Amino acid sequence: SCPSQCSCSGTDVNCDGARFASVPAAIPITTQRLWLSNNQLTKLDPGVFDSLTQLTTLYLSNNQLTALPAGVFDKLTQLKELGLDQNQLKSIPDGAFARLPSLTHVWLHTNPWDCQCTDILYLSGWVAQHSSIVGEGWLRSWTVNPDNAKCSGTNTPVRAVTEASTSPSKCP
Ligand SMILES: CC(=O)N[C@@H]1[C@@H](O)[C@H](O[C@@H]2O[C@H](CO)[C@H](O)[C@H](OS(=O)(=O)O)[C@H]2O)[C@@H](CO)O[C@H]1O
Ligand SMILES: O=C(O)CCCC[C@@H]1SC[C@@H]2NC(=O)N[C@@H]21
Protein backbone atom coordinates (compact mmCIF):
# COMPACT_ATOMS: atom_id res chain seq x y z
CA SER A 1 0.00 0.00 0.00
CA CYS A 2 1.27 3.46 -0.89
CA PRO A 3 -0.67 6.61 -1.81
CA SER A 4 -0.16 7.56 -5.40
CA GLN A 5 2.22 10.55 -5.63
CA CYS A 6 4.06 9.54 -2.44
CA SER A 7 7.41 7.81 -2.25
CA CYS A 8 7.37 4.58 -0.27
CA SER A 9 10.56 2.93 0.98
CA GLY A 10 10.25 0.24 3.60
CA THR A 11 8.66 1.86 6.64
CA ASP A 12 9.13 5.39 5.15
CA VAL A 13 6.19 7.12 3.51
CA ASN A 14 7.31 10.37 1.92
CA CYS A 15 4.44 12.61 0.72
CA ASP A 16 6.55 15.77 1.02
CA GLY A 17 5.45 18.17 -1.76
CA ALA A 18 2.62 16.00 -3.10
CA ARG A 19 0.17 18.95 -3.17
CA PHE A 20 -2.41 16.92 -1.24
CA ALA A 21 -5.49 18.72 0.07
CA SER A 22 -6.31 15.81 2.37
CA VAL A 23 -4.54 13.00 4.18
CA PRO A 24 -4.55 9.96 1.84
CA ALA A 25 -5.77 6.49 2.66
CA ALA A 26 -3.38 3.52 2.25
CA ILE A 27 -0.46 4.52 4.48
CA PRO A 28 0.66 1.13 5.88
CA ILE A 29 -0.06 0.58 9.54
CA THR A 30 3.61 -0.36 10.12
CA THR A 31 4.89 3.00 8.86
CA GLN A 32 7.67 4.48 10.98
CA ARG A 33 8.47 7.81 9.28
CA LEU A 34 5.68 9.85 7.63
CA TRP A 35 6.22 13.09 5.69
CA LEU A 36 2.99 14.95 5.07
CA SER A 37 4.85 18.25 4.82
CA ASN A 38 4.62 20.82 1.99
CA ASN A 39 1.04 19.96 1.04
CA GLN A 40 -2.26 21.87 1.36
CA LEU A 41 -3.69 20.22 4.47
CA THR A 42 -6.16 22.44 6.33
CA LYS A 43 -7.49 20.06 8.97
CA LEU A 44 -7.03 16.65 10.49
CA ASP A 45 -10.08 14.72 11.40
CA PRO A 46 -9.98 12.97 14.79
CA GLY A 47 -8.50 9.53 14.62
CA VAL A 48 -6.63 9.95 11.30
CA PHE A 49 -3.39 8.62 12.80
CA ASP A 50 -4.86 6.15 15.33
CA SER A 51 -3.79 2.98 13.50
CA LEU A 52 -0.23 4.30 12.89
CA THR A 53 1.06 3.11 16.26
CA GLN A 54 4.64 2.44 15.00
CA LEU A 55 5.31 6.08 13.99
CA THR A 56 8.63 7.48 15.15
CA THR A 57 8.55 10.65 13.02
CA LEU A 58 5.65 12.72 11.78
CA TYR A 59 6.18 15.84 9.64
CA LEU A 60 3.12 18.08 9.14
CA SER A 61 5.16 21.24 8.47
CA ASN A 62 4.35 23.58 5.59
CA ASN A 63 0.59 23.15 5.36
CA GLN A 64 -2.42 25.32 6.18
CA LEU A 65 -3.47 23.61 9.36
CA THR A 66 -5.76 25.95 11.29
CA ALA A 67 -6.38 23.65 14.27
CA LEU A 68 -5.65 20.21 15.65
CA PRO A 69 -8.37 18.01 17.11
CA ALA A 70 -7.99 16.89 20.68
CA GLY A 71 -6.27 13.52 20.94
CA VAL A 72 -4.90 13.43 17.39
CA PHE A 73 -1.48 12.18 18.61
CA ASP A 74 -2.71 10.01 21.49
CA LYS A 75 -1.81 6.62 19.86
CA LEU A 76 1.68 7.65 18.77
CA THR A 77 3.56 6.74 21.94
CA GLN A 78 6.78 5.87 20.06
CA LEU A 79 6.99 9.32 18.37
CA LYS A 80 10.40 10.97 18.57
CA GLU A 81 10.00 13.78 15.99
CA LEU A 82 7.02 16.03 15.38
CA GLY A 83 6.96 18.83 12.78
CA LEU A 84 4.19 21.42 13.19
CA ASP A 85 6.08 24.52 12.00
CA GLN A 86 4.94 26.73 9.13
CA ASN A 87 1.20 26.30 9.53
CA GLN A 88 -1.76 28.44 10.62
CA LEU A 89 -2.10 27.12 14.16
CA LYS A 90 -3.35 29.48 16.87
CA SER A 91 -3.14 27.05 19.82
CA ILE A 92 -2.64 23.41 20.76
CA PRO A 93 -5.48 21.44 22.45
CA ASP A 94 -4.91 20.82 26.13
CA GLY A 95 -2.81 17.72 26.69
CA ALA A 96 -2.14 17.16 22.96
CA PHE A 97 1.45 16.10 23.60
CA ALA A 98 0.94 14.32 26.90
CA ARG A 99 1.08 10.82 25.40
CA LEU A 100 4.32 11.50 23.49
CA PRO A 101 6.97 10.57 26.12
CA SER A 102 9.80 9.87 23.63
CA LEU A 103 9.90 13.19 21.77
CA THR A 104 13.38 14.49 21.10
CA HIS A 105 12.73 17.00 18.26
CA VAL A 106 9.71 19.27 17.92
CA TRP A 107 9.15 22.11 15.45
CA LEU A 108 6.52 24.67 16.36
CA HIS A 109 7.82 27.92 14.83
CA THR A 110 6.19 30.05 12.12
CA ASN A 111 2.65 29.75 13.40
CA PRO A 112 0.39 32.65 14.39
CA TRP A 113 0.07 31.53 18.00
CA ASP A 114 -2.75 33.56 19.65
CA CYS A 115 -1.32 34.45 23.04
CA GLN A 116 -4.14 36.70 24.24
CA CYS A 117 -6.41 33.68 24.49
CA THR A 118 -6.48 31.32 27.46
CA ASP A 119 -6.23 28.32 25.07
CA ILE A 120 -2.50 29.10 24.60
CA LEU A 121 -1.52 28.25 28.20
CA TYR A 122 -1.14 24.51 27.55
CA LEU A 123 1.37 25.23 24.80
CA SER A 124 3.08 27.94 26.81
CA GLY A 125 3.64 25.67 29.79
CA TRP A 126 4.62 22.76 27.57
CA VAL A 127 7.34 24.70 25.75
CA ALA A 128 8.66 26.07 29.03
CA GLN A 129 8.97 22.50 30.37
CA HIS A 130 10.31 20.91 27.17
CA SER A 131 12.48 23.77 25.98
CA SER A 132 15.49 21.58 25.14
CA ILE A 133 13.63 19.78 22.31
CA VAL A 134 11.95 22.78 20.59
CA GLY A 135 13.99 23.92 17.61
CA GLU A 136 14.52 24.43 13.90
CA GLY A 137 16.49 23.10 10.97
CA TRP A 138 17.19 19.61 9.75
CA LEU A 139 19.95 17.03 10.25
CA ARG A 140 23.27 18.94 10.52
CA SER A 141 21.42 22.24 10.75
CA TRP A 142 19.09 21.30 13.65
CA THR A 143 19.26 23.91 16.40
CA VAL A 144 17.42 24.14 19.71
CA ASN A 145 15.60 27.44 19.86
CA PRO A 146 12.49 27.35 22.09
CA ASP A 147 11.98 31.13 21.70
CA ASN A 148 11.20 30.59 18.04
CA ALA A 149 7.59 29.81 18.90
CA LYS A 150 6.35 33.40 18.99
CA CYS A 151 3.09 35.11 19.75
CA SER A 152 1.38 36.42 16.62
CA GLY A 153 2.09 40.09 16.07
CA THR A 154 4.70 40.35 18.82
CA ASN A 155 8.25 39.32 19.54
CA THR A 156 7.22 37.61 22.75
CA PRO A 157 8.03 33.86 22.97
CA VAL A 158 5.02 31.63 23.62
CA ARG A 159 6.86 30.18 26.64
CA ALA A 160 6.98 33.63 28.35
CA VAL A 161 3.21 34.04 28.46
CA THR A 162 1.55 34.00 31.87
CA GLU A 163 -2.05 33.34 32.74
CA ALA A 164 -2.54 36.95 33.93
CA SER A 165 -1.95 38.22 30.39
CA THR A 166 -4.63 35.97 28.81
CA SER A 167 -8.40 36.19 28.83
CA PRO A 168 -11.12 33.59 28.18
CA SER A 169 -13.09 36.33 26.45
CA LYS A 170 -10.45 36.80 23.75
CA CYS A 171 -10.83 33.34 22.28
CA PRO A 172 -12.52 33.21 18.86
C1 LIG B 1 11.71 13.49 2.57
C2 LIG B 1 12.73 14.32 3.29
O1 LIG B 1 13.68 13.78 3.90
N1 LIG B 1 12.46 15.63 3.37
C3 LIG B 1 13.32 16.63 3.98
C4 LIG B 1 12.50 17.67 4.72
O2 LIG B 1 11.82 17.03 5.80
C5 LIG B 1 13.36 18.84 5.20
O3 LIG B 1 12.56 19.95 5.63
C6 LIG B 1 12.57 20.23 7.00
O4 LIG B 1 11.50 19.52 7.73
C7 LIG B 1 11.56 19.85 9.14
C8 LIG B 1 10.56 18.97 9.86
O5 LIG B 1 9.42 18.87 9.01
C9 LIG B 1 11.37 21.33 9.30
O6 LIG B 1 10.13 21.71 8.64
C10 LIG B 1 12.42 22.08 8.61
O7 LIG B 1 12.02 23.49 8.55
S1 LIG B 1 12.88 24.67 9.30
O8 LIG B 1 12.24 25.99 9.11
O9 LIG B 1 14.33 24.55 8.92
O10 LIG B 1 12.71 24.44 10.80
C11 LIG B 1 12.37 21.71 7.18
O11 LIG B 1 13.40 22.42 6.53
C12 LIG B 1 14.24 19.39 4.09
C13 LIG B 1 15.30 20.33 4.62
O12 LIG B 1 15.86 21.05 3.53
O13 LIG B 1 14.95 18.32 3.45
C14 LIG B 1 14.12 17.32 2.88
O14 LIG B 1 14.96 16.37 2.33
O1 LIG C 1 16.41 28.70 7.61
C1 LIG C 1 16.66 29.41 8.62
O2 LIG C 1 16.83 30.65 8.48
C2 LIG C 1 16.72 28.77 9.99
C3 LIG C 1 15.50 27.88 10.12
C4 LIG C 1 14.20 28.68 10.14
C5 LIG C 1 13.93 29.27 11.53
C6 LIG C 1 12.61 30.06 11.55
S1 LIG C 1 12.74 31.53 10.72
C7 LIG C 1 11.27 32.15 11.59
C8 LIG C 1 11.31 31.60 13.00
N1 LIG C 1 11.99 32.48 13.93
C9 LIG C 1 13.14 31.97 14.32
O3 LIG C 1 14.05 32.58 15.21
N2 LIG C 1 13.31 30.77 13.78
C10 LIG C 1 12.19 30.37 12.98
Residue numbers in the entry: 1 to 172
From the reporting publication:
As antigen receptors, the lamprey utilize a family of highly diverse proteins called variable lymphocyte receptors (VLRs), which contain multiple, tandem leucine-rich repeat (LRR) motifs. The resulting VLRB protein is a 15–25 kDa, crescent-shaped protein with a continuous beta sheet where its concave surface forms the antigen binding site. This VLRB, termed O6, is the first reagent to our knowledge that specifically recognizes the 3-O-SGal determinant on glycoproteins with high sensitivity. To better understand the molecular determinants of glycan recognition, we determined crystal structures of unliganded (apo) O6 and a co-crystal structure of O6 in complex with (3 S)Galβ1-4GlcNAc.
The side-chain NH of Trp35 hydrogen bonds with 3-OH of GlcNAc, while Asp16 hydrogen bonds with the nitrogen of the GlcNAc acetamide group. Two water molecules mediate interactions between Ser37 and Asn62 and GlcNAc and Gal hydroxyl and O groups. The binding interactions observed in the crystal structure are consistent with the CFG glycan array and ITC data where VLR O6 makes specific interactions with 3-OH of GlcNAc and the 3-SO3, 4-OH, and 6-OH of Gal.
